[PDB]
Amino acid sequence: GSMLDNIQEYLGVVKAKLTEFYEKVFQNFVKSLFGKPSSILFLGIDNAGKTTLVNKLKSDSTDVYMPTHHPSTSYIEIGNLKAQVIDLGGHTAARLAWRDYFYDCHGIVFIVDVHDVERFQEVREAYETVLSLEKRAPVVVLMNKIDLEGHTPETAEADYQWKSWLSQETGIENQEDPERGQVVKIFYVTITSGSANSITGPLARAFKWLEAMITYNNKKESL
Amino acid sequence: GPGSMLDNIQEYLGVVKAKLTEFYEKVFQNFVKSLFGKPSSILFLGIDNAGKTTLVNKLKSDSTDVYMPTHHPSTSYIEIGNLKAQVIDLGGHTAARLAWRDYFYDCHGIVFIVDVHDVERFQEVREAYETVLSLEKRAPVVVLMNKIDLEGHTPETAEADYQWKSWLSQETGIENQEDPERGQVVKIFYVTITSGSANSITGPLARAFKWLEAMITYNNKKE
Amino acid sequence: GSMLDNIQEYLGVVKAKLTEFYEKVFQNFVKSLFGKPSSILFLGIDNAGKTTLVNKLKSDSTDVYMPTHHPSTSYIEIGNLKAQVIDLGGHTAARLAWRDYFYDCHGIVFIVDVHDVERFQEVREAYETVLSLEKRAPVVVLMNKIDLEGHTPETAEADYQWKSWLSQETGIENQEDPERGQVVKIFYVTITSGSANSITGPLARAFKWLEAMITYNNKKESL
Amino acid sequence: GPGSMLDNIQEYLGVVKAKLTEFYEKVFQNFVKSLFGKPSSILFLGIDNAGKTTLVNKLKSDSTDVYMPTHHPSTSYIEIGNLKAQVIDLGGHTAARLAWRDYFYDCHGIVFIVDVHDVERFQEVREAYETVLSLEKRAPVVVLMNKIDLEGHTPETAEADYQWKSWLSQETGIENQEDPERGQVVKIFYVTITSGSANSITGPLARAFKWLEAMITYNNKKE
Numbered sequence: 082g083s084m085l086d087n088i089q090e091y092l093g094v095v096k097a098k099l100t101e102f103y104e105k106v107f108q109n110f111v112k113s114l115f116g117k118p119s120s121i122l123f124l125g126i127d128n129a130g131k132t133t134l135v136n137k138l139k140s141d142s143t144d145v146y147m148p149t150h151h152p153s154t155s156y157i158e159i160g161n162l163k164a165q166v167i168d169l170g171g172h173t174a175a176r177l178a179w180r181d182y183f184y185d186c187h188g189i190v191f192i193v194d195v196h197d198v199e200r201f202q203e204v205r206e207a208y209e210t211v212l213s214l215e216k217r218a219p220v221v222v223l224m225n226k227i228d229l230e231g232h233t234p235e236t237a238e239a240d241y242q243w244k245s246w247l248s249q250e251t252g253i254e255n256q257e258d259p260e261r262g263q264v265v266k267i268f269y270v271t272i273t274s275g276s277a278n279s280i281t282g283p284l285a286r287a288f289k290w291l292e293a294m295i296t297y298n299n300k301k302e303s304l
Numbered sequence: 305g306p307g308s309m310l311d312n313i314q315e316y317l318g319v320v321k322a323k324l325t326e327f328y329e330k331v332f333q334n335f336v337k338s339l340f341g342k343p344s345s346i347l348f349l350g351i352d353n354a355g356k357t358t359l360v361n362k363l364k365s366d367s368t369d370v371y372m373p374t375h376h377p378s379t380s381y382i383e384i385g386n387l388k389a390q391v392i393d394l395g396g397h398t399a400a401r402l403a404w405r406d407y408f409y410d411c412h413g414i415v416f417i418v419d420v421h422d423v424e425r426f427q428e429v430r431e432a433y434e435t436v437l438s439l440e441k442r443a444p445v446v447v448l449m450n451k452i453d454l455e456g457h458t459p460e461t462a463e464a465d466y467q468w469k470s471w472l473s474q475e476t477g478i479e480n481q482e483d484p485e486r487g488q489v490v491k492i493f494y495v496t497i498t499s500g501s502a503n504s505i506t507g508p509l510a511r512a513f514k515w516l517e518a519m520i521t522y523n524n525k526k527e
Numbered sequence: 528g529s530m531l532d533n534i535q536e537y538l539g540v541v542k543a544k545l546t547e548f549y550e551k552v553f554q555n556f557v558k559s560l561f562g563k564p565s566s567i568l569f570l571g572i573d574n575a576g577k578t579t580l581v582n583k584l585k586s587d588s589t590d591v592y593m594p595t596h597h598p599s600t601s602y603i604e605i606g607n608l609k610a611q612v613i614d615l616g617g618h619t620a621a622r623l624a625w626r627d628y629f630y631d632c633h634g635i636v637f638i639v640d641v642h643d644v645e646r647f648q649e650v651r652e653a654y655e656t657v658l659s660l661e662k663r664a665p666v667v668v669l670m671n672k673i674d675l676e677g678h679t680p681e682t683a684e685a686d687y688q689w690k691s692w693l694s695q696e697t698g699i700e701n702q703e704d705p706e707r708g709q710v711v712k713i714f715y716v717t718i719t720s721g722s723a724n725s726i727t728g729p730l731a732r733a734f735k736w737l738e739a740m741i742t743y744n745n746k747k748e749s750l
Numbered sequence: 751g752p753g754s755m756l757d758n759i760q761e762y763l764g765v766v767k768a769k770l771t772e773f774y775e776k777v778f779q780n781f782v783k784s785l786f787g788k789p790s791s792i793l794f795l796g797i798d799n800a801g802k803t804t805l806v807n808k809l810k811s812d813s814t815d816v817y818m819p820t821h822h823p824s825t826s827y828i829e830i831g832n833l834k835a836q837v838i839d840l841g842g843h844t845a846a847r848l849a850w851r852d853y854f855y856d857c858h859g860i861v862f863i864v865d866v867h868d869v870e871r872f873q874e875v876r877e878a879y880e881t882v883l884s885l886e887k888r889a890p891v892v893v894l895m896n897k898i899d900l901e902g903h904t905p906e907t908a909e910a911d912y913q914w915k916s917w918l919s920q921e922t923g924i925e926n927q928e929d930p931e932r933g934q935v936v937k938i939f940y941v942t943i944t945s946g947s948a949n950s951i952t953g954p955l956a957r958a959f960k961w962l963e964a965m966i967t968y969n970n971k972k973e
């Protein structure tokens with residue numbers, strides 16, 4: 082009996098260090114994606130998971146939130162990522178108040194709570210608001226909280242009925258051809274899962290796609 | 305480059321974390337086999353859907369322990385080292401209170417499992433428990449109030465919710481009798497059998513088995 | 528460049544936890560070897576590695592050295608292991624001063640520094656002293672510091688010339704048959720290596736052999 | 751039982767620790783490949799037995815980098831990403847100071863390695879260094895005083911031993927010239943190339959390469 086003493090506590094301590102390490106790799110990978118300072122707007126209605134995502138990207142040691150004066154906004158510099166977070170509302174013409182935030186905007190991360198179906202009308206208005214203020218920058222869409230529908234990223238990608246219904250209710254559609262103008266790509270994620278830190282998982286591939294599209298814009302504007 | 309090296313680091317960290325998790329479970333399995341120094345007939349009892357098969361699957365080692373075919377669909381049997389585990393699905397209303405009497409021959413201890421969420425079936429639980437106590441008047445009885453996670457409880461917050469503990473005893477008829485000098489003993493533990501922490505050899509689930517073994521040893525000292 | 532930041536520090540932290548864990552398993556395995564309190568004498572001339580070995584076995588949290596008044600002796604209780612350490616000297620008839628330490632002695636660990644060849648005469652006298660004061664208890668011999676000869680336990684075991692020369696110079700010979708009287712078995716170890724914590728390595732097998740021989744004595748004295 | 755479970759835990763901890771050690775080395779290898787953004791001819795120089803082949807083997811990735819056959823037995827050549835590593839074993843007394851001149855065409859930097867323990871060959875080192883400086887009058891020179899472990903030094907205690915540092919400079923003729931405004935630059939680093947900590951991307955060995963790359967970039971800014 083005494084031979085099992087503390088074995089489990091050591092397994093737990095090691096597992097905890099492995100989890101911190103796993104998260105650190107994600108933070109490093111994302112921080113290294115942006116070679117020049119890039120203004121990224123994290124947008125969506127409240128409770129979608131924006132603050133959760135930005136907290137996932139930041140290093141608690143080096144990155145510090147800056148005070149904004151509007152309660153709907155957040156700002157933190159994560160290496161070259163200048164992350165501006167905005168809780169949208171929708172269904173208002175006072176959307177022009179935010180126009181300054183889209184000056185020299187490099188990319189957008191738009192987050193949707195797929196579980197909060199009743200607020201899909203706000204989402205489509207919030208999304209319509211974004212597309213009218215920013216007409217050039219790439220938009221990556223995170224369909225978040227798929228775990229609340231019992232989905233992983235793999236089973237969600239195969240649920241073609243549900244993907245069509247989500248696009249129908251929010252108005253968000255893919256436009257993955259950069260020759261055809263502004264680009265939009267939808268990803269299905271659970272931002273709070275531990276596997277979301279995988280640098281080959283959908284969340285990380287969404288940032289790699291966004292970065293590649295920002296690089297396409299920077300090369301096209303130079304020619 | 306370095307990108308392919310960090311993906312290999314992350315993939316390896318996950319493989320290791322899963323293997324350490326498997327070891328954490330094996331420690332629980334070895335702890336249980338070492339509790340019983342002589343062959344002991346333990347009856348795992350309760351109405352169906354309470355978590356009996358789940359608990360016994362958690363106790364067994366998939367390599368060496370094999371379920372044996374029984375004739376009744378309500379019964380299961382597996383030898384886990386010296387733990388001779390007899391599982392019986394009780395339940396429903398019936399005048400056949402004697403139907404299971406033979407299974408109590410040379411019974412050493414009872415694990416009685418209750419689903420604390422299924423409040424509608426508490427009358428079946430109360431009848432099942434009364435049936436058990438009328439067939440076994442000597443062996444120690446450990447009561448697992450299971451599925452406390454469905455009430456938003458951990459084992460720690462469950463133990464402090466004296467109001468809820470009294471209500472469970474009132475509705476099922478199950479009461480503590482922890483004095484071995486006063487006759488047959490009963491002790492209630494509050495657990496979530498499907499949780500990973502249920503594998504902790506210092507957790508309530510493991511303390512319930514250590515308490516049961518200590519009571520079986522106390523009884524054997526008198527005999 | 529920033530993508531490699533702190534990756535190495537995490538690999539080092541995890542490796543350090545793995546090393547502590549590896550050592551803890553050895554401490555648990557050895558502590559569990561002795562089911563009843565057992566007086567084990569750790570003997571040899573000074574600088575052989577006795578204090579190093581006992582420090583390797585103890586848990587710094589629970590096990591505490593007790594003050595002795597002779598500077599040549601040490602005593603610590605490690606679970607059921609009552610470890611009495613004595614720096615021998617040899618070449619003196621005042622060896623009878625230590626006779627009390629061999630009353631109810633259960634086993635002996637005799638340690639030799641294979642590198643300190645010039646002091647082999649003290650070792651043989653120290654060894655002769657031991658065999659004259661204790662004529663019943665099993666003796667396990669650790670030929671220690673084999674790394675200073677460029678040996679691992681495997682290459683040392685194959686160096687039959689050097690094993691013969693060590694036995695010739697110290698007078699220590701094997702007697703592994705318990706029917707033929709007192710038993711002696713020689714093991715080749717590097718007590719300071721990390722692999723010496725392996726519970727299937729020579730150091731651990733030496734303690735398992737000693738325990739089995741003590742059990743043979745206890746069964747023979749009961750018949 | 752539990753004994754076979756702890757041996758499997760220990761064996762697994764060792765397998766993991768070795769794989770983490772391999773990853774620690776791969777981080778060093780990736781760090782070196784990422785230092786050189788353009789093809790750079792680096793000459794690794796010194797008398798034989800100084801540690802040149804050991805250093806270059808530490809830099810290369812065994813999967814992708816392959817030594818190419820040279821015609822002289824004193825020379826080695828391997829392309830490690832953009833690092834074009836030319837190794838030349840200098841040494842002995844000779845009037846053939848021009849023999850290696852062709853290898854200095856388009857030379858970008860020099861790594862000159864000295865064995866600090868082989869004091870008898872310090873005159874060969876001094877002649878080798880004088881030969882090098884007469885063939886290359888522009889490229890930055892990083893000097894690795896290697897094998898400091900044989901003097902009982904770590905990189906930290908070596909840096910504070912100003913008496914020993916002055917003696918090494920006096921006996922080999924190697925002096926620091928860290929001002930790039932004052933012409934060709936030389937910087938001395940104190941390392942143990944065979945140690946595992948030599949893989950640290952914040953250690954002296956890695957700082958020597960970062961210093962050399964910074965000097966190559968400073969030179970290229972003028973050209």
Ligand SMILES: Nc1nc2c(ncn2[C@@H]2O[C@H](COP(=O)(O)OP(=O)(O)O)[C@@H](O)[C@H]2O)c(=O)[nH]1
Nearest residue numbers: 126127128129130131132133225226271272273
């Ligand atoms: N189940 C689940 N909850 C999530 C997920 N992402 C975020 N949340 C939760 O959603 C809540 C609101 O998130 P938050 O980042 O504060 O929202 P926002 O800043 O207003 O967009 C928090 O309790 C998060 O833990 C997800 O993928 N799954």
Ligand SMILES: Nc1nc2c(ncn2[C@@H]2O[C@H](COP(=O)(O)OP(=O)(O)O)[C@@H](O)[C@H]2O)c(=O)[nH]1
Nearest residue numbers: 351352353354355356357358450451496497498
């Ligand atoms: N939420 C929750 N589900 C549980 C728990 N224990 C068991 N279950 C689930 O309850 C269901 C019935 O369990 P089972 O072991 O088959 O019950 P049995 O009829 O008593 O053998 C299964 O789907 C289990 O996964 C628990 O602690 N929490």
Ligand SMILES: Nc1nc2c(ncn2[C@@H]2O[C@H](COP(=O)(O)OP(=O)(O)O)[C@@H](O)[C@H]2O)c(=O)[nH]1
Nearest residue numbers: 572573574575576577578579671672717718719
């Ligand atoms: N190289 C080497 N040194 C060892 C080994 N075992 C012990 N030592 C060293 O030997 C020295 C004396 O050991 P110690 O335990 O103090 O000796 P004792 O108590 O007088 O027998 C210490 O510096 C130990 O680190 C070994 O296997 N290899």
Ligand SMILES: Nc1nc2c(ncn2[C@@H]2O[C@H](COP(=O)(O)OP(=O)(O)O)[C@@H](O)[C@H]2O)c(=O)[nH]1
Nearest residue numbers: 797798799800801802803804896897942943944
């Ligand atoms: N002790 C010690 N040995 C080293 C060190 N670096 C290299 N060596 C050893 O020195 C010997 C000669 O090294 P090598 O790389 O072949 O030298 P080269 O002739 O300059 O190519 C080898 O046996 C290496 O293991 C060091 O830092 N410390």
Ligand SMILES: [Mg+2]
Nearest residue numbers: 131132155168
């Ligand atoms: Mg927020």
Ligand SMILES: [Mg+2]
Nearest residue numbers: 356357358393
């Ligand atoms: Mg069942």
Ligand SMILES: [Mg+2]
Nearest residue numbers: 577578601614
């Ligand atoms: Mg000592």
Ligand SMILES: [Mg+2]
Nearest residue numbers: 802803804839
């Ligand atoms: Mg060489």
